[PDB]
Amino acid sequence: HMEPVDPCFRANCEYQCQPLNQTSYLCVCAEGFAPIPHEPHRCQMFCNQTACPADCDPNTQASCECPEGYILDDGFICTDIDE
Numbered sequence: 337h338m339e340p341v342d343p344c345f346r347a348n349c350e351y352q353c354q355p356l357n358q359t360s361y362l363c364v365c366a367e368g369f370a371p372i373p374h375e376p377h378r379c380q381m382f383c384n385q386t387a388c389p390a391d392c393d394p395n396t397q398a399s400c401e402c403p404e405g406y407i408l409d410d411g412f413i414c415t416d417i418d419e
């Protein structure tokens with residue numbers, strides 16, 4: 337199964353890699369999954385604060401995402417009406 341480890345294709349992206357590109361390679365996740373409180377790879381998700389809460393949408397509820405990821409359940413959380 338193996339690995340040239342790409343660069344990445346292994347890296348050890350919790351999720352995964354770009355690979356690279358200016359990062360040279362990083363690690364992705366589901367790409368608003370992104371460096372939680374800590375390690376330079378992680379997701380969990382992105383929730384760059386001042387909270388994200390919860391408070392999903394109005395209308396569509398595509399929403400409250402992160403389920404999958406979860407593990408939810410602060411608020412409900414994980415979406416930043418923020419900016």
Ligand SMILES: *[C@@H]1O[C@H](CO)[C@@H](O)[C@H](O)[C@H]1NC(C)=O
Pocket residue numbers: 354355356357
């Ligand atoms: C890096 O940029 C090049 C084009 O310049 C292209 O291969 C792609 O957009 C990027 N590579 C990755 C990591 O997908």
Ligand SMILES: *[C@@H]1O[C@H](CO)[C@@H](O)[C@H](O)[C@H]1NC(C)=O
Pocket residue numbers: 370371372373374381382383384385
């Ligand atoms: C948002 O800020 C937090 C810490 O304040 C940090 O993880 C990162 O710099 C930004 N993005 C994410 C994924 O949190």
